[PDB]
Amino acid sequence: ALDGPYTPDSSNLPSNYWYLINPLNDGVVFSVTNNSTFWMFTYLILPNTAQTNVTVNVMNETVNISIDNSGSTYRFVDYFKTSSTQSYRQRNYLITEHRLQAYRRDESGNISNYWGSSTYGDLRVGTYFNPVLNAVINLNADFYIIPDSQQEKCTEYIKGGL
Ligand SMILES: CC(=O)N[C@H]1[C@H](O[C@H]2[C@@H](O)[C@@H](CO)O[C@@H](O[C@H]3[C@H](O)[C@@H](O)[C@H](O)O[C@@H]3CO)[C@@H]2O)O[C@H](CO)[C@@H](O)[C@@H]1O[C@@H]1O[C@H](CO)[C@H](O)[C@H](O)[C@H]1O
């Protein structure tokens, strides 16, 4: 149906596709930096994860972050900073039954992904207005590719699983 799966890869990805990651493992599943004003990664957290300080190696830095997930399903949590020496801070999250999240970089270089919760009723695509034109995107997960004209198909997978 879908093009894929492909093994984990880093590349300066094009803008006319959604990248549907299907991470086998928790932890860092996605990252991108422009090396100057924006660093972003997504951490997949298991259900019933009490608040924990964890050390992670991401985009060539060893950093410490807080993670938590008191829910009964998976939680993909976005972390960002806007300068080299800042600490990472949490942004949006996706609550989901499935090991699936999806990313797209728009033509202005902004990262979009899925936020919210299908079960709660506020699942949405949200865009972080922090351009990273030509930045290498690290997909730390097996993934599939979906043409940008087919966002509804991507949403279907995010909601329902593969
Ligand atoms: C107020 C509300 O709707 N709370 C929801 C909660 O919704 C948040 C999530 O969608 C997260 C995902 O990242 O985004 C939050 O909105 C962000 C927005 O995306 C940012 O751009 C903006 O800068 O900040 C806002 C605020 O941080 C949403 O607010 O999602 C949870 C989990 O599904 C819901 O349970 C929660 O609903 C509330 O649940 C409460 C008890 O658990 C109460 O029932 C309350 O009445 C519900 O509204």
Residue numbers in the entry: 64 to 225
What did the published study say regarding this structure?
For rotaviruses (RVs), which are the major causative agents of life-threatening gastroenteritis in children under the age of 5 years and result in 453,000 deaths worldwide annually, recognition of specific cellular glycans for initial cell attachment is mediated by the distally located VP8* domain of the spike protein VP4. Although structurally conserved with a galectin-like fold, sequence-wise VP8* is the least conserved among RV structural proteins contributing to a phylogeny consisting of 37 [P] genotypes9. Our crystallographic analyses provide the structural basis to explain the unique glycan specificity exhibited by a neonate-specific bovine-human reassortant RV strain and its parental bovine strain, each belonging to the P genotype. We have shown that P VP8* exhibits a novel glycan-binding site that adapts to a differential recognition of precursor glycans, which are the core elements of HBGA and human/bovine milk glycans.
To investigate how P HRV VP8* can also bind to Galβ-GlcNAc motif with β1,3 linkage, we determined the structure of P HRV VP8* in complex with LNT to a resolution of 1.5 Å. The residues N155, Y156, W178, G179 and D185, which provide hydrophobic interactions with the terminal Galβ1,4-GlcNAc moieties of LNnT, now interact with the reducing end Galβ1,4-Glc of LNT sharing a common set of hydrogen bond and hydrophobic interactions. The non-reducing terminal Galβ1,3-GlcNAc of LNT, because of the shift, makes a new set of hydrophobic interactions involving I158, S180 and Y183. Comparison of the unliganded and LNT-bound P VP8* structures also showed that ligand binding induces significant changes. The R154 side chain that pairs with the aromatic side chain of F143 via a cation–π interaction in the unliganded structure, upon LNT binding, swings around to interact with the Gal3 residue, through a water-mediated hydrogen bond, and the side chain of F143 rotates accordingly to maintain the cation–π interaction. The side chain of S180 that hydrogen bonds with the main chain NH of Y183 in the unliganded structure reorients upon LNT binding to interact with the GlcNAc moiety through a water-mediated hydrogen bond interaction. A significant change that is observed in the LNT-bound structure is with respect to Y183 in the J-K loop. The side chain of Y183 is rotated to create a hydrophobic pocket to stabilize the terminal Galβ1,3-GlcNAc of LNT. Without this side chain reorientation, Y183 would clash with the GlcNAc residue.
